Amino acid sequence: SPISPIETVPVKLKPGMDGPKVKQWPLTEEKIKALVEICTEMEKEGKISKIGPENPYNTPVFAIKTKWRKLVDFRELNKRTQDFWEVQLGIPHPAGLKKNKSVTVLDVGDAYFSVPLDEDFRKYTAFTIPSINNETPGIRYQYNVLPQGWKGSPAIFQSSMTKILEPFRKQNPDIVIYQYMDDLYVGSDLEIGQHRTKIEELRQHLLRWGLTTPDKKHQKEPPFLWMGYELHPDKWTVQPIVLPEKDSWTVNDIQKLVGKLNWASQIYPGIKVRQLCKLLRGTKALTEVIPLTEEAELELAENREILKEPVHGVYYDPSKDLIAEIQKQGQGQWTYQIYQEPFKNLKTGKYARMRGAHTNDVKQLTEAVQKITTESIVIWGKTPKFKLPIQKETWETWWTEYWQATWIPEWEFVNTPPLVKLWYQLEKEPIVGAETFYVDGAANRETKLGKAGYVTNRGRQKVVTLTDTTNQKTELQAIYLALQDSGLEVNIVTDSQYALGIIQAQPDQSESELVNQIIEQLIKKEKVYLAWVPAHKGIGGNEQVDKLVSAGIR
Amino acid sequence: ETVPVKLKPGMDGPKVKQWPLTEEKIKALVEICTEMEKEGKISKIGPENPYNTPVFAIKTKWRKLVDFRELNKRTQDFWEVQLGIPHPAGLKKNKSVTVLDVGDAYFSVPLDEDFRKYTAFTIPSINNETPGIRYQYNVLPQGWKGSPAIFQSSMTKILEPFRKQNPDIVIYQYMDDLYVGSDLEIGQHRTKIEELRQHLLRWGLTGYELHPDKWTVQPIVLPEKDSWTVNDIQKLVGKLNWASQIYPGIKVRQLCKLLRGTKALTEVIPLTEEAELELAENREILKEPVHGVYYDPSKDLIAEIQKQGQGQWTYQIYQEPFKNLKTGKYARHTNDVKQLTEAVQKITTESIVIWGKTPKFKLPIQKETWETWWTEYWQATWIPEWEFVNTPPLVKLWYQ
Ligand SMILES: Cc1ccnc2c1NC(=O)c1cccnc1N2C1CC1
Ligand SMILES: O=c1c(C2CCCC2)c(O)c2cccnc2n1O
Ligand SMILES: [Mn+2]
Ligand SMILES: [Mn+2]
DSSP: OOOOOSOOOOOOBOTTOOOOBOOOOOOOHHHHHHHHHHHHHHHHTTSEEEOOTTOOOBBOEEEEOOOOEEEEOTHHHHHHBOOOOOSOSOOOOGGGSOOOSEEEEEEOTTTGGGSBOOTTTGGGGOEEEOOSSSSSOOEEEEESBOOTTOTTHHHHHHHHHHHHHHHHHHTOTTSEEEEETTEEEEEESSOHHHHHHHHHHHHHHHHHTTOOOOOTTTSOOSSEEETTEEEOSSOEEEOOOOOOOOSSOBHHHHHHHHHHHHHHTTTSTTOOOHHHHHTTTTOOOTTOBOOOOHHHHHHHHHHHHHHSSOOOBOOOOTTSOOEEEEEEOSSSOEEEEEESSTTOEEEEEEEOOOOSSEEOHHHHHHHHHHHHHHHHHHHHSSOOEEEESBOHHHHHHHHHHSSSBOOOOSEEEOOOSSOBOOSOOOOSSOOTTSEEEEEEEEEOTTTOOEEEEEEETTSOEEEEEESSOOHHHHHHHHHHHHHHTTOSEEEEEESOHHHHHHHHTOOSEESOHHHHHHHHHHHHOSEEEEEEOOSSSOOHHHHHHHHHHHTTTO | OOOOOOOOTTOOOOBOOOOOOOHHHHHHHHHHHHHHHHTTSEEEOOTTOOOBBOEEEEOOOOEEEEOOHHHHHTTHHHHTTTSOOOOOTTTTTOSEEEEEEOGGGGGGSBOOTTTGGGGOEEEOOGGGOSOOEEEEESBOOTTOTHHHHHHHHHHHHHHHHHHHHOTTOEEEEETTEEEEEEOSOHHHHHHHHHHHHHHHHTTSOOOEEEOGGGOOOOOOOOOOOSSEEHHHHHHHHHHHHHHHHHSTTOOOHHHHTTSOSSOOTTOEEOOOSSSHHHHHHHHHHHHSOOTTOOOOTTSOOEEEEEEEETTEEEEEEESSTTOEEEEEEEEOOOOHHHHHHHHHHHHHHHHHHHHSSOOEEEESBOHHHHHHHHHHHOOOSOOOOEEEOOOOTTHHHHOO
């Protein structure tokens, strides 16, 4: 095995730190013999070199099992070695790859051992093979190449390969090479003849730089198993996903189920995970059996049906636009597909995230759009054209009136029920001939006891006592009371900006049951006007509720 | 020779992640950086450099925008209290202020050898197909606050003849820009700017027009109305109640007397006349500057922005909440994000002109939305710090 003739990367220790000096533990005779054999062969290969006892640094070695292997525990050196640039900031998504006629994998034989280590850093990699018991001074070596398990090796190997591939890439610009650890993926649109010939030009270029690669008879055939994917030059899919059929589901089994389904959702449309995830909340040990909820059973059954037949994704054509379509699956659940030619998906996915305690479908849709927009730029370097289950009018109305700024890239309405809509709206002007309710709450923070109530312009009145409450809850409770007892048209005046803010954003779902009870009442109504006044400014009706609800509370 | 630059004690360089870039901006950056590399301004680097600063492309010519916000935080002692550039109080008074991009000057001055590693940046690839192209600066970079701090003495020498010949022209440097103010007639001002450009041209270095003397207060406006309803007065007292938190001496006691007992909102009630003493004299304080509020140079500036609809945006600049140093508005094929970026830039330059620093913005937008879109509409060579907030419901109509 050759050592690459490339330039070395200068390495330093962390500022104010010296090299490791951790002592060697006594080893058994069989382990010592095994290490001696390994180290003399490594020394003849040029990988390591003998040093004297003038070198003060040490890292412990160990021998593990017919054949033996040497383990160098670099924990202490790694702690003292400088930080490096990250090996990668992300991995390619298969959907972003372009279709090739042929693609070949070439693995590098003994990757790290083929690239030299900075001469001035070599002294810190020193290790000692101990003699039988205490007696003799041990045999001392240092590394000449990138050591396995050392902090800098991944980054320095990658950087070395990049420099080696650079000449070849520049004079062969229409051949694509992806670097991954010790593997090289090489694709082109050349005919079967001059592709296999082109691999040989690469293999000879790599061998010239001390990197050996497998020949035609040894190199793997497609599909290639990589990072949980199954890759053809023509199509891609996720690796075989098999959902076990079990009588009893443990936490561990459900965690693994959700993981598989989540992974599958990249190409299998409509995958659902919500009900299965609910089973894992505040859950016990991994061995604990969780009875499947009826909704979880139905979700599992729907997923099995989806995964029944194999599904593949296509590759990316840079000359065509990307199309993203989104559908609502249920409450909080969103699903999407991206294609270039109608219904031949490059990839699929799902969105579920709950941004904030209270929300609506319009906000969730936009959040889904922004998630897909970011994904698209990462994968394809451009935004897709969207097709959304919301009318332009509905979208128009919401964006204009809402306090928050947004921008959705080019999109079209598509009639795929359920359509996104707002379930109620607040009046811009007070209602003529409707009862005006003045509301307020009060809570005692010591006892957590509180009161919620109202007074009206028609002399109506009510107070309800609450037991484990907060200021905010009592204000919502008061508003809920006013809605319950009011009739189809109502004017409601609150001194709670918190309550105002929630309701003005037209939520249709909430983490609070109380807010959900308010939402249910707002939809039943014909007209609702909600106004705000400052608290304790001698405002007529407002002062009347305050005294009423604060009595016995504060 | 190079001037030695060091980080604030106990901390090292920036390790900020490179944001995802579109196809056209990556290609633009590759062309720009290949050219700079050939000219020796930047050099390719190895993996022994663990540092990173984000890079963007903005605009018809593409230009590189390096986001040195983090490096600038970690070098504050250098550019502020070691080689600080003084800010003139006369600039905000001027009839006209012209902004000239002067960043091209910096590439003629070498960067300190031991500091070059902290200027590391990455040009990413689409879909992480290839390793990012890594560089560091060999020269004073654009966007780094240390650059005008170091070039300071060279700029003084450049402007000396022009400043001698034109004593009543204020020239201020902030980052990559030169701010040039005068009280001359517009034609004469523009003639002097052209004159200044010629001086700069002889040194290699090579506009945007402001009128700060016409920057007047944005007063909280109380409605003139004939025939008030119960709802109208409630909205009015609520606006006045909050107005009293910022303005010292706002009264609302007389207006509240009209709202006594539980009355219907649509009931039209006639006003007295005891409230008119409040109403009218409230307008007096509302149109005037806030008494007792002054800029503290040891404190950060904060900017809040509210979306008002119809392409209108209100903003406030303060250091302690309620104590408004400045208020204003921004007005507009323009979308919400585009309008907001334009407003942020407008507020920032005013802030540079008035105080010599940028505010930290509280933006009424989702983080990810802002991050994907802001460079599409960004034109400035600096970048302010920002937060992402939920606009409180009534602050909007109070500043309306
Ligand atoms: C694992 C991997 C990741 C990134 N790109 C690729 C590969 N492997 C492929 O099999 C492949 C498939 C089709 C086209 N590009 C591919 N390649 C490109 C390099 C030829
Ligand atoms: O009674 C109060 C008080 C009082 C308690 C302390 C004195 C004022 C508030 O501050 C307040 C603030 C927002 C909303 N409702 C409120 N209510 O109902
Ligand atoms: Mn209250
Ligand atoms: Mn109260």
